């Protein structure tokens with residue numbers, strides 16, 4: 134047997150806003166957070182734009198001195214985590230601190246810090262490298278710093294599954310609670326890969342949109358004129374909680390997390406199979422885990438990265454899994470607005486999936502001006518669609534053919 | 546309901562050998578793998594030695610075409626994974642490929658590749674960053690590449706929990722099998738952090754031994770003259786398999802994985818608490834998970850980093866958990882010989898713990914010339930000790946106060 138898991142707290146930094154409600158207001162208005170990247174010379178680069186977090190004040194969370202020790206991706210993950218825990222109303226005590234853990238991940242981790250410490254090393258030598266270089270750059274330090282700050286003594290770990298990180302982080306945290314290893318987990322992901330290395334690295338692979346002239350139109354999932362993904366920064370964190378634990382303290386419950394699927398494509402290092410066999414296996418695994426028929430799914434938050442092969446693989450996967458229900462569900466890519474937060478994508482998209490349930494509205498896929506060949510599903514083109522949503526899926530597909538699917542259900 | 550998990554295959558690169566048997570012969574003979582580093586000029590560094598993998602031939606494992614794309618930490622993790630899968634005798638088929646997954650992690654990942662690409666970026670511009678920069682550096686690509694080349698379609702993920710990574714990776718992979726999410730997992734870790742940023746960043750924290758003039762004596766866990774950890778490179782991988790699956794195919798079973806614990810110190814970003822409270826909580830969780838009397842523990846493969854505070858915290862934790870039985874068990878640090886493989890430490894030490902069970906011998910803590918105040922347990926000083934071992938425990942502790950413990954026992 135298995136315990137039930139609900140969402141009692143959410144937190145976010147995104148290109149749309151410095152918290153959940155501002156981000157979500159942008160999402161339902163079809164607003165783009167994409168813009169040319171500032172305070173950075175990108176002349177030599179084929180991509181000059183992305184989704185930056187705008188106006189982030191780390192001193193709302195940390196002293197300047199503790200903030201100086203940490204890469205931006207860690208600052209962003211801590212901000213989302215602190216928001217989520219505050220939003221949950223949870224009181225940590227000696228009676229429960231061993232039952233409260235953290236799993237906040239990242240796909241790429243501390244590139245900005247690595248870049249700045251490379252500058253020191255090359256020019257001046259190793260004696261200029263910061264003493265906090267390692268602990269301030271390693272991916273497990275969101276989980277680490279959060280546990281130390283809040284006194285959390287439960288399971289403490291971090292996933293790194295590239296663009297699947299946030300989805301796997303939340304799913305494996307839900308398993309920890311379901312199987313009695315924890316009663317509460319803070320789970321999600323964070324990313325800040327807008328350094329030369331991030332834009333240069335994805336740029337060297339020709340993976341990014343190069344629509345420098347119209348950055349807000351660059352992320353156009355399933356549109357025939359798409360030319361790759363848009364790199365974005367930020368963080369998402371959820372408070373996952375055992376149902377009886379949440380009820381006993383009178384928690385506000387957003388939604389129930391009923392299913393989690395994982396699969397490997399075993400296909401290609403960076404490309405998904407054109408038929409989306411791996412994504413179909415992963416969604417079937419998640420629905421089986423939830424004890425739900427494909428027909429019960431109402432809303433899918435796609436991975437929908439705006440890459441040629443990825444977007445078409447997801448259409449094929451949804452048609453394969455859902456058959457005669459494939460057109461009845463609504464599927465949208467919020468990456469059309471936020472761009473691709475890499476390891477944080479799954480985290481912010483799980484939050485948008487939960488709010489789709491709260492508000493009974495499918496967020497839009499903006500920029501979907503000319504659907505590509507066979508992209509004929511309800512992709513919620515251009516504008517939000519109020520509709521019935523009892524069951525919402527959130528899919529992530531990443532490098533190494535790593536797949537994750539979360540299934541959320543309305544709670545009443 | 547919870548299934549039993551056995552070890553059917555093991556694989557390793559270490560500073561003592563290019564496979565498990567060669568490494569283990571070095572362990573039982575008290576041999577040091579530590580020597581001045583040859584691959585780069587460290588005259589400006591305060592530490593100029595570590596545990597290198599000597600004479601690694603990537604063309605035993607990978608085409609020159611695949612190998613050139615991948616950071617050394619990925620090559621090492623693939624070498625160990627391939628060894629472990631071959632050692633297991635498992636045949637991958639259409640009938641079982643969806644039930645076989647991988648969880649190979651790293652603490653730091655592709656720091657050499659990222660450094661070298663940062664050098665190209667700063668000197669030559671973004672168009673000289675490798676197209677393989679991202680997939681060839683990010684931590685999840687051991688799991689990814691292994692899945693692509695063996696056709697593993699089970700759970701595909703990667704942990705990054707600093708010096709706890711290998712232990713967490715193996716434990717969580719065992720839970721996947723226990724709970725029915727997979728029947729087989731390849732799990733462990735790999736590390737190659739011996740670049741300027743690695744040695745420079747740990748050096749900036751004054752965390753490394755600076756015994757440059759006697760490298761083989763630098764790693765001296767619980768010795769009063771210890772002055773920090775020794776940085777080492779390599780990989781460990783285990784094939785974990787559900788018991789009845791292993792029995793059904795007539796697998797050779799090395800041992801059973803009976804217990805896994807995790808805990809967070811919630812104390813300090815890098816420092817372990819002096820009393821080892823988090824390590825004690827972690828071990829108690831693992832022993833309760835294994836349904837054991839603590840008196841059943843015969844051998845402990847310590848974390849044993851050769852740091853002043855870490856080594857004494859572990860003594861305090863073992864005394865607190867085992868009481869009078871702390872005086873009857875044997876505890877040793879194989880890091881005395883291998884140095885600290887960081888995210889791979891828990892993986893090679895899990896293999897050493899299984900071989901302690903196979904061969905009924907406690908590996909030595911070499912260099913333990915003068916045990917420090919309170920270090921009065923059986924620490925197997927200097928020479929391997931043949932003894933009865935029914936139950937072996939492997940401990941890891943890392944930055945962020947993250948703790949893992951694995952419990953293995955003989956299988957008959």
Ligand SMILES: CCn1cc(NC(=O)C2CCC2)cn1
Pocket residue numbers: 563564605606607627628629631632
């Ligand atoms: C992918 C090719 N491959 C090569 C190995 N080699 C070994 O297992 C031996 C070398 C030490 C033990 C396994 N797979």
